[PDB]
Amino acid sequence: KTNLANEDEAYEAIFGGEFGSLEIGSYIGGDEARNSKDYTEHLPDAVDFEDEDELADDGIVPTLQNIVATVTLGCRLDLKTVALHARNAEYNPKRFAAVIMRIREPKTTALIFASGKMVVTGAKSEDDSKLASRKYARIIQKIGFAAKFTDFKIQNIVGSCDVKFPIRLEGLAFSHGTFSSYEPELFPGLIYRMVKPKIVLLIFVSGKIVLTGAKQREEIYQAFEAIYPVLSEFRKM
Ligand SMILES: [Ca+2]
Ligand SMILES: [Ca+2]
Ligand SMILES: [Ca+2]
Ligand SMILES: [Cl-]
């Protein structure tokens, strides 16, 4: 039985899929702009904090596509109060037990929970992730909660790579049987579960690779360097 209106289930759903927080995009929809009755209500003089500038006190190469980070604000939050006091906040308690808040620089989304736990996504660098998180913590402080920027941690780094050559997925799936899963009628990519580093690679026919599960960017580079000779061996000539 699934109920993402429950705080714990909503938090765990972010990191609990088959690919974990790779699929965080499923939970940051907030309100549907095209749906007229779906808009988050705000107080008449609610401030838009999306331009927040203040910070709470503290060859082939893969590219970083996304960084997911966690922050402990250290205080309980009334999510309905946060939503009403911030025009850049979206809150649908019946669908997901978090306030969805967005800022423009670095362009990110925060998932803010009643316990004061926060998840920040959308950043392309560790410094941007930390900068955005410190801004969300400041916004919560400005609304009036005794929030603190603590326990910043990168939970996931998504990498993407294009090897610029097609891949023989049948032979790669057969040859690396124990570490691969390939069901092309169910999902187009070959799922490669690397042991060391512990990284999931999504290998597509086009030579486009997606790497997920890293908590350090060095793991993305290591996984790509490890898989590159395998991809070259299975190049479709
Ligand atoms: Ca939306
Ligand atoms: Ca709504
Ligand atoms: Ca297999
Ligand atoms: Cl083959």
PDB file of N, CA and C in Angstrom, residues 21 25 50 63 68 73 77 86 97 108 118 124 126-127 150 165 175 180-181 185 187 202 211 214 237:
ATOM      1  N   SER A  21      17.344   8.063  -6.768  1.00  0.00           N
ATOM      2  CA  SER A  21      17.057   9.480  -7.036  1.00  0.00           C
ATOM      3  C   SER A  21      17.310   9.880  -8.503  1.00  0.00           C
ATOM      4  N   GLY A  25      12.732  13.432 -10.709  1.00  0.00           N
ATOM      5  CA  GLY A  25      11.921  14.272 -11.581  1.00  0.00           C
ATOM      6  C   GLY A  25      10.440  13.946 -11.511  1.00  0.00           C
ATOM      7  N   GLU A  50      12.320  33.298  -5.109  1.00  0.00           N
ATOM      8  CA  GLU A  50      13.100  32.614  -6.152  1.00  0.00           C
ATOM      9  C   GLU A  50      14.411  33.348  -6.507  1.00  0.00           C
ATOM     10  N   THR A  63      29.807  14.001 -18.499  1.00  0.00           N
ATOM     11  CA  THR A  63      29.360  15.317 -18.029  1.00  0.00           C
ATOM     12  C   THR A  63      28.393  15.101 -16.887  1.00  0.00           C
ATOM     13  N   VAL A  68      21.878  15.373  -6.570  1.00  0.00           N
ATOM     14  CA  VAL A  68      20.875  15.288  -5.530  1.00  0.00           C
ATOM     15  C   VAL A  68      21.607  15.396  -4.210  1.00  0.00           C
ATOM     16  N   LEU A  73      17.604  20.861   8.345  1.00  0.00           N
ATOM     17  CA  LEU A  73      17.366  22.254   8.741  1.00  0.00           C
ATOM     18  C   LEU A  73      17.317  22.383  10.295  1.00  0.00           C
ATOM     19  N   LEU A  77       8.822  21.969  10.654  1.00  0.00           N
ATOM     20  CA  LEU A  77       8.233  22.988   9.783  1.00  0.00           C
ATOM     21  C   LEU A  77       6.773  22.780   9.592  1.00  0.00           C
ATOM     22  N   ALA A  86       5.371  31.761   0.773  1.00  0.00           N
ATOM     23  CA  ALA A  86       6.365  31.808  -0.310  1.00  0.00           C
ATOM     24  C   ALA A  86       5.719  31.522  -1.655  1.00  0.00           C
ATOM     25  N   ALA A  97       4.170  14.490   0.375  1.00  0.00           N
ATOM     26  CA  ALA A  97       4.325  15.146   1.679  1.00  0.00           C
ATOM     27  C   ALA A  97       5.560  16.017   1.781  1.00  0.00           C
ATOM     28  N   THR A 108      17.439  25.234  -9.362  1.00  0.00           N
ATOM     29  CA  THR A 108      17.244  24.015  -8.591  1.00  0.00           C
ATOM     30  C   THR A 108      15.816  23.901  -8.096  1.00  0.00           C
ATOM     31  N   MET A 118      15.493  18.256   4.069  1.00  0.00           N
ATOM     32  CA  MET A 118      15.326  18.820   2.753  1.00  0.00           C
ATOM     33  C   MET A 118      16.153  18.035   1.750  1.00  0.00           C
ATOM     34  N   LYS A 124      24.337  21.258 -11.153  1.00  0.00           N
ATOM     35  CA  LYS A 124      25.294  20.592 -12.076  1.00  0.00           C
ATOM     36  C   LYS A 124      26.725  20.530 -11.492  1.00  0.00           C
ATOM     37  N   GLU A 126      28.892  20.394  -7.347  1.00  0.00           N
ATOM     38  CA  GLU A 126      28.841  20.238  -5.880  1.00  0.00           C
ATOM     39  C   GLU A 126      28.729  21.611  -5.195  1.00  0.00           C
ATOM     40  N   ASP A 127      29.489  22.604  -5.693  1.00  0.00           N
ATOM     41  CA  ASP A 127      29.435  23.955  -5.152  1.00  0.00           C
ATOM     42  C   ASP A 127      28.041  24.576  -5.404  1.00  0.00           C
ATOM     43  N   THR A 150      22.624  22.476   8.107  1.00  0.00           N
ATOM     44  CA  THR A 150      23.502  21.435   8.677  1.00  0.00           C
ATOM     45  C   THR A 150      23.448  20.139   7.872  1.00  0.00           C
ATOM     46  N   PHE A 165      29.396   6.097 -31.184  1.00  0.00           N
ATOM     47  CA  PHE A 165      29.381   4.885 -31.993  1.00  0.00           C
ATOM     48  C   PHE A 165      28.261   3.967 -31.476  1.00  0.00           C
ATOM     49  N   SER A 175      27.457 -11.564 -23.034  1.00  0.00           N
ATOM     50  CA  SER A 175      28.843 -11.644 -22.546  1.00  0.00           C
ATOM     51  C   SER A 175      28.995 -11.265 -21.057  1.00  0.00           C
ATOM     52  N   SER A 180      24.619  -7.514 -16.207  1.00  0.00           N
ATOM     53  CA  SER A 180      23.671  -6.840 -17.103  1.00  0.00           C
ATOM     54  C   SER A 180      22.238  -7.367 -16.999  1.00  0.00           C
ATOM     55  N   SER A 181      21.289  -6.520 -17.423  1.00  0.00           N
ATOM     56  CA  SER A 181      19.866  -6.810 -17.549  1.00  0.00           C
ATOM     57  C   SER A 181      19.387  -6.095 -18.792  1.00  0.00           C
ATOM     58  N   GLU A 185      12.083  -5.041 -25.048  1.00  0.00           N
ATOM     59  CA  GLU A 185      10.645  -4.804 -25.280  1.00  0.00           C
ATOM     60  C   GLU A 185      10.005  -4.098 -24.066  1.00  0.00           C
ATOM     61  N   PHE A 187      12.277  -1.991 -21.686  1.00  0.00           N
ATOM     62  CA  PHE A 187      13.076  -0.766 -21.527  1.00  0.00           C
ATOM     63  C   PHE A 187      14.203  -0.750 -22.598  1.00  0.00           C
ATOM     64  N   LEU A 202      23.239   2.936 -17.691  1.00  0.00           N
ATOM     65  CA  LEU A 202      22.161   2.735 -18.654  1.00  0.00           C
ATOM     66  C   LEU A 202      22.814   2.901 -20.026  1.00  0.00           C
ATOM     67  N   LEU A 211      25.056   7.394 -16.172  1.00  0.00           N
ATOM     68  CA  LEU A 211      25.719   6.792 -15.013  1.00  0.00           C
ATOM     69  C   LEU A 211      25.098   7.356 -13.766  1.00  0.00           C
ATOM     70  N   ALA A 214      26.574   7.574  -7.973  1.00  0.00           N
ATOM     71  CA  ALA A 214      27.817   8.121  -7.398  1.00  0.00           C
ATOM     72  C   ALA A 214      27.537   9.150  -6.295  1.00  0.00           C
ATOM     73  N   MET A 237      30.095  -2.246 -36.083  1.00  0.00           N
ATOM     74  CA  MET A 237      30.848  -1.801 -37.260  1.00  0.00           C
ATOM     75  C   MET A 237      30.009  -1.912 -38.520  1.00  0.00           C
TER      76      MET A 237
END
